[PDB]
Structure 1
Amino acid sequence: ETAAAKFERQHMDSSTASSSNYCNQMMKSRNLTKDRCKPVNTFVHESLADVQAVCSQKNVACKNGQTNCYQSYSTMSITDCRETGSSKYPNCAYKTTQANKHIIVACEGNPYVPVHFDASV
């Protein structure tokens, strides 16, 4: 799996919504609960073209100190998945929360594409 492909699997769910069951099902189907319960994960509902375009938008500092992060000029429809208190592997359990926020992604490679989801603001 390429880094670009991993980003698409972990963070992209293009749709033009999310039920209380959404994260429980999506974290499983996208193979994010295979080894452990991933505590926090965000899905983005805008088009792949729109998210890829963020790599040419506002340059901002990455949480890790690198300079290859970019913030979206427009807000984007997203869903945050957060592990519940009662959640126990292999039965990982999640709270589903919809939001409309600017996203921050890290980009790499040629083509220069998103490889990491840094934050929403």
Structure 2
Amino acid sequence: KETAAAKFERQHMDSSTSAASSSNYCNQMMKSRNLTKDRCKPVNTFVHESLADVQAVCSQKNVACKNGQTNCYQSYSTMSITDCRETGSSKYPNCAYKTTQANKHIIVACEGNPYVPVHFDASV
């Protein structure tokens, strides 16, 4: 069983590139992070920042999670992110994603000891 933290890392961390530099980025990364194995995962954000910078957000701005839980934090600064979202012509096992690169505040739910991100809630 994957831990909540290790799963957050696999689904949401891309510290190896500063930004999606091509429209194929989401197709490539959704497959290589194993988010197209069973089904096509509809929506997924990647963060182009150090793991340490993303972990740090857990002691930044405490805000409500959109499920009404109170263990969510908004990053004080903007961060390089890529939105991956299935297009109309996506059908498992031929998953097709739209790649939208952006610079936005991230909101993560944090849990545990150490107190680390376990869910990507949104970016603003």
> In structure 2, how many angstroms separate the alpha carbons of the residues matched to 1:13 and 1:84?
22
8 Å Cα contact 1:18/1:79 also seen in 2: no
CA deviation after TM superposition for structure 1 residue 15, in Å: 3.4
8 Å Cα contact 1:41/1:80 also seen in 2: yes
SS state of the match for residue 7, structure 2?
A: helix
Find 2:47's aligned residue among 19, 38, 44.
44
SS state of the match for residue 62, structure 2?
A: strand
8 Å Cα contact 1:107/1:113 also seen in 2: yes
- Identity percentage of aligned residues: 100
> In structure 2, how many angstroms separate the alpha carbons of the residues matched to 1:78 and 1:15?
12
TM-score scaled by length of structure 2: 0.95
State the Cα RMSD in Å.
0.9
> In structure 2, how many angstroms separate the alpha carbons of the residues matched to 1:44 and 1:102?
10
8 Å Cα contact 1:18/1:96 also seen in 2: no
User: After superposition, what is the alpha-carbon deviation per residue over 1:82-108, rounded to whole angstroms, capped at 9, x for unaligned?
Assistant: 100011100100010100000000000
CA deviation after TM superposition for structure 1 residue 35, in Å: 1.2
CA deviation after TM superposition for structure 1 residue 74, in Å: 0.3
Residues paired across the two proteins, number:
121
CA deviation after TM superposition for structure 1 residue 18, in Å: 3.0
User: After superposition, what is the alpha-carbon deviation per residue over 1:35-90, rounded to whole angstroms, capped at 9, x for unaligned?
Assistant: 11111100000000000000000000001111000000000000000100011100
8 Å Cα contact 1:81/1:97 also seen in 2: yes
SS state of the match for residue 82, structure 1?
A: strand
> In structure 1, how many angstroms separate the alpha carbons of the residues matched to 2:15 and 2:5?
16
What runs of 5+ residues in structure 2 fail to find an aligned partner?
A: none
> In structure 1, how many angstroms separate the alpha carbons of the residues matched to 2:101 and 2:90?
20
| Aligned position for 2:4 | 3
TM-score scaled by length of structure 1: 0.97
Regions of 4+ moved over 2 Å: 15-18
> In structure 2, how many angstroms separate the alpha carbons of the residues matched to 1:79 and 1:15?
13
> In structure 2, how many angstroms separate the alpha carbons of the residues matched to 1:18 and 1:96?
10
